[PDB]
Amino acid sequence: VMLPDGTSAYTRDGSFQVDQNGQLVTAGGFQVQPAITIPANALSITIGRDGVVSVTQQGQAAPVQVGQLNLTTFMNDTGLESIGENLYIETQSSGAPNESTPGLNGAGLLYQGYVETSNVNVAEELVNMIQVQRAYEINSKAVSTTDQMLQKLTQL
Amino acid sequence: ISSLWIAKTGLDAQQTNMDVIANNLANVSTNGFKRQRAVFEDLLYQTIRQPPSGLQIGTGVRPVATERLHSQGNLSQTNNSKDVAIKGQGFFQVMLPDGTSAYTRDGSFQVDQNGQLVTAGGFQVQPAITIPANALSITIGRDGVVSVTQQGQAAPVQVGQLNLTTFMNDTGLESIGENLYIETQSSGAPNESTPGLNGAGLLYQGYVETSNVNVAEELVNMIQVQRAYEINSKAVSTTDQMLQKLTQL
Amino acid sequence: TLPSGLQIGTGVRPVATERLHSQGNLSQTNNSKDVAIKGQGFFQ
Amino acid sequence: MISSLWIAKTGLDAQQTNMDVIANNLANVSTNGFKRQRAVFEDLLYQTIRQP
Amino acid sequence: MISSLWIAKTGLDAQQTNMDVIANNLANVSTNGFKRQRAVFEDLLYQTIRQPGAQSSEQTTLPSGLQIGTGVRPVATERLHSQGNLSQTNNSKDVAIKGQGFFQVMLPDGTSAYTRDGSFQVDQNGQLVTAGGFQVQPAITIPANALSITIGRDGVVSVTQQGQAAPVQVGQLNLTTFMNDTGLESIGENLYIETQSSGAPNESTPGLNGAGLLYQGYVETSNVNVAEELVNMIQVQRAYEINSKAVSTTDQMLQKLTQL
Amino acid sequence: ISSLWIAKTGLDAQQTNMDVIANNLANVSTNGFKRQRAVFEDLLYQTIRQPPSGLQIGTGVRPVATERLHSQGNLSQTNNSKDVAIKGQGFFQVMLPDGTSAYTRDGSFQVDQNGQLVTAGGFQVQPAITIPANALSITIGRDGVVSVTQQGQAAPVQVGQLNLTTFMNDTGLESIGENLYIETQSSGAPNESTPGLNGAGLLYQGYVETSNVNVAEELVNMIQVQRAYEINSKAVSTTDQMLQKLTQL
Amino acid sequence: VMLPDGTSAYTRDGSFQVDQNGQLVTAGGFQVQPAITIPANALSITIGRDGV
Amino acid sequence: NGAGLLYQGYVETSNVNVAEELVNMIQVQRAYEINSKAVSTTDQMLQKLTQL
Amino acid sequence: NGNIQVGPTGQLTIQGHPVIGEGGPITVPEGSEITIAADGTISALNPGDPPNTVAPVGRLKLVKAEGNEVQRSDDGLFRLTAEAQAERGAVLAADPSIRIMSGVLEGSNVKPVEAMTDMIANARRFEMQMKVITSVDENEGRANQLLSM
Amino acid sequence: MSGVLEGSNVKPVEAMTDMIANARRFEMQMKVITSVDENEGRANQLLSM
């Protein structure tokens, strides 16, 4: 994705739209790279399983291939610098990005009409909340004990 | 404290989500209504430098947009000559009182005391279509031509043409209520085109386009929204109790 | 920028009731007084 | 409401029209010079989800 | 939220698609030339966790790795082009198809559509039109003073004038066969349009090169087996029951997670 | 502290079980889908030394595998000439767009524009079969030989052979979606074998195999999963209360 | 069951499978001693009440 | 020689009695609270002792 | 700490200062998709290759040592006690009987119960010491009157 | 729009979190006040002579 300041970020988010000019953008107007421009009067858009995006025109019995929506894979996915807005920027801990067509060179495929969900396991978070609360109480007890000992020292 | 702020953002996002769900659910049985989905987005992340090159805490789940699904809605038979529904893309242009135009993907038309074609509330459609005083029947074809049948005359005289409008980005229109949308700087210029041509759909007379609201989607989403709201509530309570314990010394 | 703004939207309002003024089926009342209308029109 | 329900409503109304035509044909036996009618139907929209 | 709720939601959507297809098929009984539809389903991603290979020791192999999976995305709706039953409409201008083939029709925009219908008429000018005025191809104009319209099995349409005891051959009605019938994209109106899944059309005279014959006075009914649709309705409703029960279970699990 | 993590592992196992049950229940009425069962496994035990020469406490219930049940499903009649189903074991080979081969236990076939025999998603079925342009009818015998009938010729011209593929370890093939499996290092090498031979299964034209999901077992297992979830949550709550009571003193 | 390191463990669990070579395993690939090697293309597997 | 038979197609389930575990859990929580009370009582005894 | 990580260039690094196994630092191909077995073998499947190419790429060395024969070394890392060095040598063997539990981490063994009474007893002992100090100084101060006059 | 009234825009979640924050802040200030008063009381003994 091309950021307004010119650098390229990366997103695992598919809620695309089209600006008033036809370019693919990401819920926030960030252009998707390379730019994909839709004609004005497309009856339907189709993004295949390897990103070949095409449109159907009134009259043509053929979906003119309008663009390619290629992916980018990183050597260390975890090292990305999340800058918010569902975008990551690559850093020295992630390596240079390797761009390729979907389904080739280790990149995944594309599912049109479906969007990926957050992989947050709420059971983990609830149990972690209990853990955090009780550990906090324990450390608070430690502070209190030390403070009382210091009081007793400073009385004499 | 920052945890409370984060959890408040989460509760706000879930409550906005519930508002969107409820608006979709209410507007079932509203002709030509296009359901809405709220798309959310995380906030900036706070970086703490390590003497990777840093950890990220982050905050917030602000909603970034509410995007309408401008798909095709099912048809409902009303057996009314005036009602008309749309095949595929397109909008009907309507002249608001103030002078600018709105655009409606609706078909509950009528005629006023003058003959003009209006939309259930008197907003005159464009271009003006006048039905003569004694039209025995009124017919609207698949390319929009509207004609009437007069008594005695053995032919339907053509009386109007019902053009549609198409936008580059349908979602960008901002809704003003009243089943009406208006042009913005994001939806591009309105293309006035004859139905069936240049990406515009067609017209079905006697039929009105239903709302494309899937209620199973919204029921499962209601379950999800309630559960997420209660989880973030648990987060708020946990932070409250840790602050309890902190101030007790 | 911002390919779609966010709007929450509230509820729904009944805006009208329109009467379908079509032609109804006839019934044979076998009564001299009674009369029916073919097509548009009303008795004042 | 449901995509199923509006389709089923259209089916019911089509069958109702068909019964109307049958009843008018069948009531007009013993009517001189009457001509039988027959209703011809026609499927509605097809909401494309994936283009063929 | 929960991995289970999204899965159940996709199951609900798949069953609703199944019921949609059943309702559309079931309402289009008594529609001529309508073709049955059947939805083909398709499972979604499988999140690999332990690779099915990825030996668990130096010599071992770790068979049948752990992967969970989601979703029941509908992949297609194949339309069954099998011959439908005939019905004797007694009307001289109705023709049914004996085997494969499609009647070509000129859309008002100029493009060509294809219908398996027989409900033909005559408009002001004698042109053969189909219940909506979409004029058939190639043009067949019946003369004004005709009495009989006969459409032989080969498609040769000829009429008989008053007194003139010669059935003048007035036109030919030839069929259009597609190498892939199922690929046609339906536009309503009992009309399908060409797409680059169907392939280029082969226009030919009926009977020859695989096209079907023409039965005048009969119309081809829909090939919808209502018994199968009813039992499918039972099965679809029960599957909906089961999936909503799964949603209920996940919801109650989440609820006691919340009360924690 | 301790019991908290043990009970969390129990919750995760119950949730994985519920996820697998949900995938089984959703995929009913998916052709050739083989239902899945998750086998679980307790984690490492810790030995406390006695000055029996020790006891164990142990922890966790980590899931080890999801084994697919590769049994025979029922057959449902589709009245479609192209569709086929399999008696006994065997898989249909398919050429993925990248170039490798997948294997499907599904027969909802159909012919593309080139006459190739593809599988509901366009992936060509190996070995290639080309139905001629104007075939009157297509038949696929019980040994997988496919033939068509042309006008004029009073004999069915033999078109192709629909071979099967057998694996040493049927469960090993990993699911990649669209009812497709791919070869793994645990599933051994594939054997291209004609139907009815070398233990491969027969072919049935006009029928399609169904999912072997016993929904009664699914519902009772799902009752189990819910109640176990509630029991483990009771354990989590009890441990939370014990820690809270501890930190007070 | 023959452990990876050579010694013998014992399991009351029947979640068995077959690896790529026909050997019985225990949900994690540990071989069940003594080895039982299922032929390549069996139609069906039967384990009797006495293990035959 | 005392070995049990084999039943194919079936898996043995865990012999865990969950009602027993719940009752034991209640007992464990109450005993934990009582012992914490013992610790707390001794601790306040010690507080008073070290006051003077 | 089994929280293993991979760098962009394929260095297995339990929080950096990397991990040692069967040779130097363990290195894997950059498109790792690592799996770790029960006895320590590490297998790697490049994402875009057929899954029957999971040939093992390394082994994770594990060592048996506990308590009396291990001491902390001013980092989170432990070493041998130099009393267990005229013994099993400077660099231990792999001990091919220590097993790995994959997909599972281990938390700290910080017993809150014994820590809470550690702190209670500590506070009580401290203020007992303060009482002794108070009495001693008061003794000395009241004593100092001997020498005067 | 006629026939429709408008209610108050008092968001309850922000008010609720604000009230929790207010309470905790008050407790923190009370702790600081107690500490300062104890310091002053202990320190007034210095002037003794």
**d(C-alpha A64, C-alpha A77), whole Å:** 35
Amino acid I75 reads D
User: Is residue I56 less than 8 Å (CB to CB) from chain E?
Assistant: yes
Half-sphere exposure of J25 toward its Cβ, with a 13 Å CA cutoff? 8
Helix (H, G, I), strand (E, B) or coil at F132: coil
Measured CA to CA in angstroms, residue E156 lies from B114, E114, E200, E217 at distances of 54, 19, 24, 15
Q: Show residues of chain D in contact with A113, CB under 8 Å.
A: 49
Interchain CB distance below 8 Å, G50 and H11: no
Place of tokens 């996709």: E10
Backbone angles phi, psi at E222, to 5 degrees: -65, 145
Is chain E in touch with chain I: ≥3 Cβ pairs within 8 A? yes
Judge contact between F85 and F203, C-beta under 8 A.
yes
Interchain CB distance below 8 Å, A17 and C3: yes
Judge contact between E116 and E190, C-beta under 8 A.
yes
Is chain G in touch with chain A: ≥3 Cβ pairs within 8 A? no
Indicate the residue of A104, A121, A134 with minimum beta-carbon distance to F247: A134
Helix (H) / strand (E) element for F190: namely strand F190-193
Q: Which of J16, A91, D25, C12 is nearest to B55 (CA)?
A: A91
Among all residues of chain F, which has the CA nearest to that of H31? F242
Q: Where are the alpha helices (DSSP H) in chain B?
A: 2-26, 215-247
**d(C-alpha E81, C-alpha E101), whole Å:** 10
Q: Which two tokens stand for residue F22?
A: 């949900």
Q: What does the buried/exposed string (b/e) look like for A39-72 if buried means 16 or more CB atoms within 10 Å of the residue's CB?
A: eebbbebbbbbbbbbbbbbbeebebeebbebbbe
Interchain CB distance below 8 Å, F234 and H22: yes
Q: How far is B140 from chain D (nearest CA, A)?
A: 17
How many Cβ pairs within 8 Å bridge chains G and H? 18
Q: How far is E55 from chain G (nearest CA, A)?
A: 8
End-to-end CA distance of chain J: 82
Interchain CB distance below 8 Å, F97 and A103: yes
User: Which residues, in sequence order, are CB contacts of F80 under 8 Å at separation 6+?
Assistant: E38, E78, E80, F108, F206, F208
Half-sphere exposure of J8 toward its Cβ, with a 13 Å CA cutoff? 3
Q: Show residues of chain I in contact with E62, CB under 8 Å.
A: 37
Interchain CB distance below 8 Å, F245 and H36: yes
Residue among J24, J25, J29 with most chain B CBs within 10 A, to mutate: J24
**d(C-alpha J25, C-alpha C2), whole Å:** 39
Q: Which two tokens stand for residue B207?
A: 């039929």
Interchain CB distance below 8 Å, H50 and I120: no
Among all residues of chain A, which has the CA nearest to that of D48? A44
Among all residues of chain H, which has the CA nearest to that of I125? H50
How determined?
cryo-EM
Indicate the residue of D1, D2, D6 with minimum beta-carbon distance to B75: D6
**d(C-alpha B24, C-alpha B16), whole Å:** 12
Is chain A in touch with chain E: ≥3 Cβ pairs within 8 A? yes
Burial class (CB in 10 A: 0-12, 13-18, 19+), J21: middle
Q: Answer positive or negative: Cα dihedral of I62, I65, I69, I71.
A: positive
Q: How far is C4 from chain J (nearest CA, A)?
A: 25
Q: Show residues of chain F in contact with A123, CB under 8 Å.
A: 8, 11-12, 15
Pairing label, strands F123-126, F92-95: antiparallel
Q: Which of E63, F4, E251, F46 is nearest to F12 (CA)?
A: F4
Resolution (A): 3.2
Q: Which two tokens stand for residue E69?
A: 């999976």
Name all contacts of H47-50 with Cβ < 8 Å and 24+ positions apart: H47/I124, H50/I124, H50/I127, H50/I128, H50/I131
Q: Show residues of chain I in contact with G5, CB under 8 Å.
A: 39, 96-97
Q: Which two tokens stand for residue I15?
A: 């929080």
Interchain CB distance below 8 Å, B27 and C39: no
User: Is residue G44 less than 8 Å (CB to CB) from chain F?
Assistant: no
Q: Show residues of chain D in contact with A44, CB under 8 Å.
A: 48, 51
Q: Which two tokens stand for residue E232?
A: 């499918």
DSSP state of B125: B
Please state at what angle helix F215-248 crosses helix H18-51, rounded to 10 degrees. Answer: 10
Judge contact between F164 and F194, C-beta under 8 A.
yes
User: Is residue F237 less than 8 Å (CB to CB) from chain H?
Assistant: no
Which of I:23-42 have CB within 8 Å of A? 30-31
Report the 3 state secondary structure along chain A.
Answer: CECCCCCECECCCCCCEECCCCEEEECCCEECCCCCECCCCCCEEEECCCCEEEEECCCCCCCCEEEECCEEECCCHHHCEECCCCCEECCCCCCCCEEECCCCCCCCCCCCCCCCCCCCCHHHHHHHHHHHHHHHHHHHHHHHHHHHHHHHHHHC
Judge contact between A49 and A103, C-beta under 8 A.
yes
Among all residues of chain E, which has the CA nearest to that of B228? E1
Alpha-carbon dihedral I84, I85, I86, I87, rounded to 10 degrees: 60
Judge contact between E38 and I20, C-beta under 8 A.
no
Interchain CB distance below 8 Å, G48 and H12: no
Amino acid A122 reads V
Omega into G39 within 30° of 0, i.e. cis? no
Q: Show residues of chain A in contact with F4, CB under 8 Å.
A: 127, 130-131
Q: How far is H8 from chain I (nearest CA, A)?
A: 29
User: Is residue E195 less than 8 Å (CB to CB) from chain A?
Assistant: yes
Omega into B127 within 30° of 0, i.e. cis? yes
Helix (H, G, I), strand (E, B) or coil at B87: strand
Q: Which two tokens stand for residue E138?
A: 């190639």
Alpha-carbon dihedral D5, D8, D13, D14, rounded to 10 degrees: 150
Measured CA to CA in angstroms, residue B132 lies from B115, B144, B162, F78, F177 at distances of 6, 18, 16, 55, 61
Name all contacts of H35-41 with Cβ < 8 Å and 24+ positions apart: H36/F245, H36/F246, H36/F248, H36/F249, H39/F249, H39/I117, H39/I120, H40/F248, H40/F249
**d(C-alpha F162, C-alpha F196), whole Å:** 12
Measured CA to CA in angstroms, residue H46 lies from B230, F44, F248, H52, I125 at distances of 44, 42, 17, 10, 9
End-to-end CA distance of chain A: 67
CA-based angle E108:E179:E31, to the nearest 5? 55
How many Cβ pairs within 8 Å bridge chains B and C? 66
Q: Which of B142, B69, B153, B61 is nearest to B105 (CA)?
A: B69
**d(C-alpha G36, C-alpha G17), whole Å:** 11
Neighbours of chain E (3+ CB pairs under 8 A): A, B, D, F, G, I
Is chain F in touch with chain C: ≥3 Cβ pairs within 8 A? no
End-to-end CA distance of chain D: 27
Neighbours of chain I (3+ CB pairs under 8 A): A, E, F, G, H
**d(C-alpha I43, C-alpha I53), whole Å:** 9
- One DSSP character per residue, chain E reads --HHHHHHHHHHHHHHHHHHHHHHHHHTTT-TT--EEEEEE------BSS-SSS-SSSS----S--B------EEEEEEE--PPPEEE---TT-EEEESS-BEEEE-TTS-EEEE----EEE-TTSBEEETTTEEBSS--B--TTEEEEEE-TT-EEEEEESS--S-EEEEE--EEE-S-GGGPEE-STT-EE--TTT---EEE-TTSTT--EEEETEEEPP---HHHHHHHHHHHHHHHHHHHHHHHHHHHHHHHHHT-
User: Is residue A112 less than 8 Å (CB to CB) from chain F?
Assistant: no
Q: Show residues of chain I in contact with F43, CB under 8 Å.
A: 101, 104
What is the number of H-type helices and E-type strands within chain F?
A: 2, 20
Radius of gyration in angstroms for the set of CA atoms belonging to chain H, rounded to a whole number: 24
Judge contact between F62 and F13, C-beta under 8 A.
yes
Q: Which two tokens stand for residue E70?
A: 């989601």
User: Is residue B76 less than 8 Å (CB to CB) from chain D?
Assistant: yes
Q: Show residues of chain B in contact with A79, CB under 8 Å.
A: 52
Helix (H, G, I), strand (E, B) or coil at F53: coil
